[PDB]
């Protein structure tokens, strides 16, 4: 998240690309926007513990209770996975990923 | 640098040693809802005295 982008092409970096225990850093060219939220209205209460120290915790939830989630566009994410597949099939030729 | 910055920022804050006690937790969310991950835990905290 929030990184620097590649210049013109998706760049696939790994130590070997044949050892299966090596993490592949895929570097995109176009960023994909994610929107993350926790929608339930939460509160805060302070519980005094010892001299001069407090402890902040959840006191109550006001309103209805909904689901914390994140939203990505499906078309853009499909296009990004397809372009990563384009750049990745030339390192694993004549194969389906 | 990230590890040491995290530790030296987290050093002078409140330590939660007196809170590790026996918790009585019944229920917080009314029904299953979306995810009933809340839990209403009560305990015997220590005051200034």
């Amino acid at each position: 998240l929030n990184g620097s982008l590649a210049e013109k092409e998706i760049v696939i970096r790994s130590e070997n690309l044949t050892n299966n225990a090596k993490i592949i850093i895929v570097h995109l060219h176009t960023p994909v926007e994610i929107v993350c939220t926790r929608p339930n209205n939460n509160t805060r209460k302070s519980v005094r513990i010892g001299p001069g120290q407090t402890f902040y915790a959840t006191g109550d939830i006001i309103g209805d209770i909904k689901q914390a989630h994140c939203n990505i566009s499906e078309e853009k994410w499909n296009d990004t996975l397809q372009k990563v597949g384009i750049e990745l099939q030339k390192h694993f030729p004549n194969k389906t990923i | 640098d990230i590890i040491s910055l995290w530790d030296q920022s987290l050093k002078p804050c409140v330590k939660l040693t007196p809170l590790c006690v026996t918790l009585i937790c019944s229920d917080a969310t009314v029904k299953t809802g979306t995810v009933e991950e809340m839990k209403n835990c009560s305990f015997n905290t220590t005051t200034e005295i």
């Epitope: 929608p39 339930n40 209205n41 006001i62 309103g63 209805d64 209770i65 909904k66 689901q67 989630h69 | 969310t29 009314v30 029904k31 299953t32 809802g33 979306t34």
Partner: antibody, heavy 126, light 106 residues
Amino acid sequence: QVQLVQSGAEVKKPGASVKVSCKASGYRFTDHYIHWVRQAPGQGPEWMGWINTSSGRSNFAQKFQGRVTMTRDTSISTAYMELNRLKSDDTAVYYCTTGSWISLYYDSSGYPNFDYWGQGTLVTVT
Amino acid sequence: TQPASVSGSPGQPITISCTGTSSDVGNYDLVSWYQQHPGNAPKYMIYEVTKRPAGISNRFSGSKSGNTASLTISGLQAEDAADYYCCSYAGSSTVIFGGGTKVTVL
């Protein structure tokens, strides 16, 4: 066309409890919020509470706490309003209204989109 | 807050206002208008700050300025003498009303 059926008149002495039923027809009971509106005669209406019909979570007004409970049954698709310790000022018309769309991702409970109103009931405290 | 009553001749627009606080109308644009004939359930023709549901013509139009919301009725007819109430979201998932405006169509 959807329609909400409400109960008949309730005549009783002060100090007792009143249950008001609201039965929905024509649409799914689980899909929409149910709000309650109390209107005294010669007086404008007043919102009194909402219920989530999917999980039974309900909230009331700032001064109806401790006197009001709200239940529902999704099998026969109805909601119940229980009011305890009535007084002579509780003589009013009670309305079951259909609110916003129940969604799993955002809080649309407080939206005052009262689409369909029931026929209401009259509660007279003598 | 709401004016007690308004009066007007047929064929001309009128305005009914509702002045709330910053938390009621200023923070959230959730305002609505409901007319009510006597001896009947309240109607429903405004739900958002300006929108209208199906089956309602362009007689009524909502607007919001600052901390108040005004409903403009473009022309007056004999059935337009009902009691009008404004309504809004207010604070901690609660809903408040206006109180009432009686329209006197001449």
